Amino acid sequence: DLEDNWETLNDNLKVIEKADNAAQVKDALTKMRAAALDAQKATPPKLEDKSPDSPEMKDFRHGFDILVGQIDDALKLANEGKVKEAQAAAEQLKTTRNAYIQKYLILNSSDCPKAGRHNYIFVMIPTLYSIIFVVGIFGNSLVVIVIYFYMKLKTVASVFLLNLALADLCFLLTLPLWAVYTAMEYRWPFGNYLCKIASASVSFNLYASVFLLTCLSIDRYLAIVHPTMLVAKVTCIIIWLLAGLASLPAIIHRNVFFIENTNITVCAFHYESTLPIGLGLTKNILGFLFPFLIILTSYTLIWKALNDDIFKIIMAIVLFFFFSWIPHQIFTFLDVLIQLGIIRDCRIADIVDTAMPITICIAYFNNCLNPLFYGF
Ligand SMILES: CCCc1nc(C(C)(C)O)c(C(=O)O)n1Cc1ccc(-c2ccccc2-c2nnn[nH]2)cc1
Numbered sequence: 001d002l003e004d005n006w007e008t009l010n011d012n013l014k015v016i017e018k019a020d021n022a023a024q025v026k027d028a029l030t031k032m033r034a035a036a037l038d039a040q041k042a043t044p045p046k047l048e049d050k051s052p053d054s055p056e057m058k059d060f061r062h063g064f065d066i067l068v069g070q071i072d073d074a075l076k077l078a079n080e081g082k083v084k085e086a087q088a089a090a091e092q093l094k095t096t097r098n099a100y101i102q103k104y105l106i107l108n109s110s111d112c113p114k115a116g117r118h119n120y121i122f123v124m125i126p127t128l129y130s131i132i133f134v135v136g137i138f139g140n141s142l143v144v145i146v147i148y149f150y151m152k153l154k155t156v157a158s159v160f161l162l163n164l165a166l167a168d169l170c171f172l173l174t175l176p177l178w179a180v181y182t183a184m185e186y187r188w189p190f191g192n193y194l195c196k197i198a199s200a201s202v203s204f205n206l207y208a209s210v211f212l213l214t215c216l217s218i219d220r221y222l223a224i225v226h227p228t229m230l231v232a233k234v235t236c237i238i239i240w241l242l243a244g245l246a247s248l249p250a251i252i253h254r255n256v257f258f259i260e261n262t263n264i265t266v267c268a269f270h271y272e273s274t275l276p277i278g279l280g281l282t283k284n285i286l287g288f289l290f291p292f293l294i295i296l297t298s299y300t301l302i303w304k305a306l307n308d309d310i311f312k313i314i315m316a317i318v319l320f321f322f323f324s325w326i327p328h329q330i331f332t333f334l335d336v337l338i339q340l341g342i343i344r345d346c347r348i349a350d351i352v353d354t355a356m357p358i359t360i361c362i363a364y365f366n367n368c369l370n371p372l373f374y375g376f
Pocket of ligand 1: 178182198199200202203206249250254267269356357360364
């Protein structure tokens, strides 16, 4: 935990400022020495695709030798019983802290920084996120309990729809963190752990859902074109594995970063060959093309052929879900043209950046209205 180490140091360093005697100084200094060594083992935000033996990481750890070496000589004063002398030596860690934020914790400024910053986006988006949240909680909470009661896990279709309800709940728990994020004019108070798991949870919902809907399609194809409860459950737990592993880029590259040397802290992806677009497009093929073709060719048969009740809900979930992702896939494509440097105009950037939040709501609006399709 590298953020906690800096919190431990910055908190202890303030105990030195308000100190009285050498014992109180040493007690705080001895704890700061431990956190530097614990930090020196860690990997910083910007050095993700580099080895522990890289010259970048050798420089990371050398910075924390300069830290520990400075904490040594300050301790030497506190062992001798020199408080006012030691209090000065501890202020040398402020230049190390400053040096550190500049090198690893500042996101490289775009040409169009303010693009997307509009007041209505910071009131519209959170209140949308709030509605999607609480409706979706009571919505998908009702669906799981009626599956235990009424359906009682009778069908093979029933189990995939129970899983989809749970996958929607896992997503919804996190939303409050993005609601306020956007309400705070894009700044993230919740730290670096939650930056990752809350970003891994929305990628999850995309992979989980589409794999679950692929199974609902393949199920309804097999169930009434060529008329396995154990195998369905074996699939569902394997879907969670692949959706977790597909969301593993959210855990690796997401970090809380400052911007342009300011107070406000953003929870952004680090991109850093240009294979991040080359393999940033393999999510679209495996997300869209692999399921979409299988799911179209699944239903185009059984719709034309045709049991009926469960087909009506799955069709409505499937058609909406994919129609919802068209608006966003258009603008996230456009955003990749902006990131690459293909398109310059900041007025165009502004349009894409302001559109993005809205298109994201639409893509994840299904998590609260999927329960409404069960009603029917
Ligand atoms: C439902 C997501 C809510 C959300 N809204 C926003 C903004 C644009 C500020 O309004 C953000 C945001 O970019 O930080 N988020 C997090 C987020 C978005 C997409 C993804 C995502 C979705 C699919 C595939 C990959 C990712 C992803 N992972 N890491 N980075 N993007 C992950 C987290």
